[PDB]
């Protein structure tokens, strides 16, 4: 049930200049990537996965947004509840699927910038498609990350990062929890968009001066809440609420990382049928445990490096994800 997709980035500059030979390949046809293990493109030995769907290193933001992000967007704007989780080793390209880059020298505007990822996209796809159709609509985002299991809200403008939230169970509907001063941003339109993300950049500048490798330890959640009032072509009124959690996981390649660790075996009881599941041992899983068996549509994007240097983690993180596809939830 849970859908999980790789994304194998292409060689840099560096690599390039080097003549990096890829020890990675991918058949988005077959859904298939193969690796190879033991070395030689003469002769060689090979591990084959097959995952819901794989994007080999030619693959633009646009390719990643139409087939993966689009038809879950659809699934949010009809009321439901969805997960995008981005898992890989530190430097694969797990932010540049989620977030995206600006092209250099001010060559395009936010909108139209094909470095584009997916929250930039789909906060403005929220506005295109909303507007267009007869719907009344809110839109609310959140950026909560956690760090040594600590909660920093990174919206917020009249706080530091030195302010960390607290988390409760919410009394109310169960498995869920609260977190105490949690700032919901509303994004009244379209051209509000850009500033929130910058803001929240800046902050984050600020977080990871103060908190050592914050890039690389921290999980994200970037949230969007859809209030929505449609009014059809003849007068039916339809009150959805849809909300969208992406979330930016912290490097997957091995102080610790609780959160990490807990995730890891959240995922292996869930698909060892084992009727303990260890949710409440890390933030992050308390937090995300309706999207890890729960009543969530949940993806997985894991993020690989071409480089035969990689290898050892490459494998870690495809074996990884293979495992996540046996997760049923709803
Ligand atoms: N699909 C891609 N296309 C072009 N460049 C990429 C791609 N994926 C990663 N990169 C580049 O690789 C580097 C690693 O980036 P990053 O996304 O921040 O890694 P991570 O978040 O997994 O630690 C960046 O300089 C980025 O521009
Ligand atoms: N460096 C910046 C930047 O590229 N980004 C900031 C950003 C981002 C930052 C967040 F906190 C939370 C979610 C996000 F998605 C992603 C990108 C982006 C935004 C729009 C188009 C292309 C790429 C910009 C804002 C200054
Ligand atoms: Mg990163």
Redesign the pocket.
């Known amino acids: 049930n849970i859908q999980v997709v790789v994304?194998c980035?292409?060689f840099?500059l560096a690599e390039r200049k080097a003549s990096a030979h890829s020890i990675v390949e991918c058949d988005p046809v077959r859904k298939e990537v193969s690796v190879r293990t033991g070395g030689l493109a003469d002769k060689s030995s090979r591990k084959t996965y097959t995952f819901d769907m794989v994007f080999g290193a030619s693959?633009k933001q646009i390719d990643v947004y139409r087939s993966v992000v689009c038809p879950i967007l659809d699934e949010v704007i009809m009321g439901y509840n969805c997960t995008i989780f981005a898992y890989?080793?530190?430097?694969?390209?797990?932010?540049?699927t989620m977030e995206g880059?600006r092209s250099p020298n001010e060559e395009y505007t936010w909108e139209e910038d094909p470095l584009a990822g997916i929250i930039p996209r789909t906060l403005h796809q929220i506005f295109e498609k909303l507007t267009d159709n007869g719907t009344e609509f809110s839109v609310k985002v959140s950026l909560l990350e956690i760090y040594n299991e600590e909660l920093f809200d990174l919206l917020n403008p009249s706080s530091d990062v030195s302010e960390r939230l607290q988390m409760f169970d919410d009394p109310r509907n169960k498995r869920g929890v609260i977190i105490k001063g949690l700032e919901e941003i509303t994004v009244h339109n379209k051209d509000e968009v850009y500033q929130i993300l910058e803001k929240g950049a800046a902050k984050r500048t600020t977080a990871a001066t103060l908190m050592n490798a914050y890039s690389?330890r921290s999980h994200s959640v970037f949230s969007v809440t859809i209030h929505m009032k449609e009014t059809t072509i003849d007068g039916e009124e339809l009150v959805k609420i849809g909300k969208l959690n992406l979330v930016?996981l912290a490097?997957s390649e091995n102080n610790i990382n609780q959160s990490l660790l807990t995730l890891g075996r959240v995922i292996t009881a869930l698909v060892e049928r084992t009727p303990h599941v260890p949710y409440r041992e890390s933030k992050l899983t308390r937090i995300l445990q309706d999207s890890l068996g729960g009543r969530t549509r949940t993806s997985i994007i894991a993020?690989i490096s071409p480089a035969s240097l990689n290898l050892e983690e490459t494998l870690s993180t495809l074996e990884y994800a293979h495992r996540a596809k046996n997760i049923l939830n709803k």
Do not use: L, V, W
């Open positions: 994304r980035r292409p840099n693959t890989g080793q530190t430097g694969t390209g797990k932010t540049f880059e690389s930016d490097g993020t």
